[PDB]
Write a protein that binds this ligand. Structure first.
Ligand SMILES: CN(C)[C@@H]1C(O)=C(C(N)=O)C(=O)[C@@]2(O)C(O)=C3C(=O)c4c(O)cccc4[C@@](C)(O)[C@H]3C[C@@H]12
Ligand SMILES: CN(C)[C@@H]1C(O)=C(C(N)=O)C(=O)[C@@]2(O)C(O)=C3C(=O)c4c(O)cccc4[C@@](C)(O)[C@H]3C[C@@H]12
Lengths: 276, 276
DNA sequence: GACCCTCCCCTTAGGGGAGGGTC
DNA sequence: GACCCTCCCCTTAGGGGAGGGTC
């Protein structure tokens, strides 16, 4: 009333740190009513304690301090407007997050699916849910000469609307009685999508399409160049012997087993191909 | 394939800034496969481009970099677990925000209500929705000697569970034919609550209770010491003349008109009191 | 030219000290 | 002792330069 509080008093009363109060002092956001010229001690009137209500609340919603300053000079109506503005900012974040939460949930679904492949090396046949992807003409690209840099555009679009890139890399090709990997060329390289956000200015050389819900002859193994071709052969054989008919191209996905640059690279490969 | 990308190439391919790549280099998160000893130029193999998928995605969800490091060495299963952990962190933020969004919406409702008081200075009678508050014994505290520091404990609890403090300050007293502000003493001082989060270790000297839904004789004005008492008198008179019966104490709320420390302080005052 | 280098300063909002003089 | 002072270093993840030597 007829005295000042010293900074410690104010700090206990307002549950704000001393270091905080000295800061707010520095930045002319909250300044002691009076400062002893000899001890440079800070002293605060009781009535001025009220300006902390606003600072503490804005701080809680996380308004930057320089913002708070321009906040103080607001009329009750403009303060209303300002709050409305926060409501907007928030709702934006809530959307971002509901989205994020789902994307992750799905990434997890896919990862699990891969940690459950019944047999590596063996040809299992199974029923698969639809997979949406974005693909693009593979212009004379075999397994032998394809690079990560080849995925640069696809990646750019997908991550530009999914925000998530860590993923698996895809390729399709014609099912033939290949006798040599030398004979192989990809029709498309592709990359799966995780969101429904619309890619923004998608150019015509990208096709958005999917891997149809259907029944697939699959095979999946950890990568090694010996095994790559010979496993493909396992598959062609599986179909040969069971006289199955194919209704799609061979799909091929390579997903990394880890991303530590300290261990030798290792990749899970999965070839599947739809049948009637 | 049989060459390196220079940092600019990698930057365009992976849509990551050069300054970013030099940083990741510094912190041994991503390092060029090779560094020219003479030009200190950075050079990156195509195959190592894959470690950016993970970094870019973690960055999107906003994992700190030192975290990403310990992320890299994870097995596909532990990476799963890690993601689950993010799902937790997020859901936490989504809650925080749905909460925040509501609190604000309500603050706005109250503010509006105050920018619509039909007449300042005049005694309007009206129907009011319930107001939840937290109050505490006012120990020999009149209008004449009450301080902001008096609200220190209430404030602490309410903000400890509401996160929002900027507010209005309350007091109640007995409705009497007062002849002098000298004669006035508050029964309680109080402060409204905005959340339903439970105050955590609430001590018994606080009572959580509310201002009942009911019909109230109100009066509200911008503060000035001349007017304070004389307006209270206006109210006592209103009731006298209409022979109304009172079923509650006088409630009194002071909310600030602005929080700029640059203008002369100004407060909206509102006295209301319930009737049959 | 175009491209890359290191090195330096700047960005929030204070928290943690050290070392001094205080109520 | 308890309390307060200034002053200094440290915390993310780089962006923006300046000034040098490059492909
Ligand atoms: C585009 N694609 C399907 C694969 C890819 O982009 C990869 C990647 N980004 O991780 C593989 O590492 C991928 O680049 C990769 O590792 C491949 C190979 O190195 C080989 C080699 O050396 C010999 C035979 C077959 C392959 C291969 C078909 O598995 C190659 C697949 C490549
Ligand atoms: C607790 N309460 C209801 C009010 C309060 O805490 C205030 C605040 N924190 O802003 C008022 O400024 C409050 O502290 C305040 O301003 C009050 C006063 O200064 C006076 C004076 O000087 C003379 C008569 C009446 C009042 C008064 C009743 O309006 C006082 C109300 C005070």
């Amino acid at each position: 009333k007829e005295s000042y509080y010293s900074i410690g008093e104010v700090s206990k009363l307002a549950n704000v740190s001393i270091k905080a109060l000295r800061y707010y002092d520095k930045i002319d956001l909250f300044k002691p009513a009076y400062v002893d010229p000899d001890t440079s001690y800070r002293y605060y009137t009781d009535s001025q304690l009220i300006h902390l209500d606003l600072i503490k609340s804005l701080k809680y919603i996380g308004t930057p301090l320089e913002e708070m300053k321009k906040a103080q000079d607001l009329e009750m109506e403009e303060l209303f407007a300002f709050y409305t503005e926060q409501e907007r900012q928030i709702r934006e974040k809530l959307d971002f997050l509901s989205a994020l939460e789902q994307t992750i949930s799905l990434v997890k679904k896919r990862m699990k699916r891969q940690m459950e492949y019944p047999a590596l090396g063996e040809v299992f046949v199974l029923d698969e849910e639809e997979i949406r992807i974005i693909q693009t003409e593979a212009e004379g690209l075999g397994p032998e000469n394809v690079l990560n840099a080849s995925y640069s555009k696809l990646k750019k679009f997908i991550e530009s609307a999914d925000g998530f890139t860590n993923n698996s890399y895809g390729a399709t090709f014609s099912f033939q009685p290949y006798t040599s990997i030398d004979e192989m060329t990809y029709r498309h390289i592709f990359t799966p999508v995780l969101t429904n956000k619309q890619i923004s200015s998608i150019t015509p050389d990208m096709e958005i399409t999917t891997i149809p819900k259907g029944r697939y002859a699959c095979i999946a193994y950890n990568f090694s160049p010996e095994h790559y071709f010979l496993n493909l052969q396992k598959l062609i054989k599986y179909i040969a012997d069971r006289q199955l008919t194919v209704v799609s191209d061979v799909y091929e996905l390579i997903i990394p087993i880890h991303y530590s640059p300290k261990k030798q690279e290792e990749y899970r490969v999965e070839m599947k191909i739809r049948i009637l």
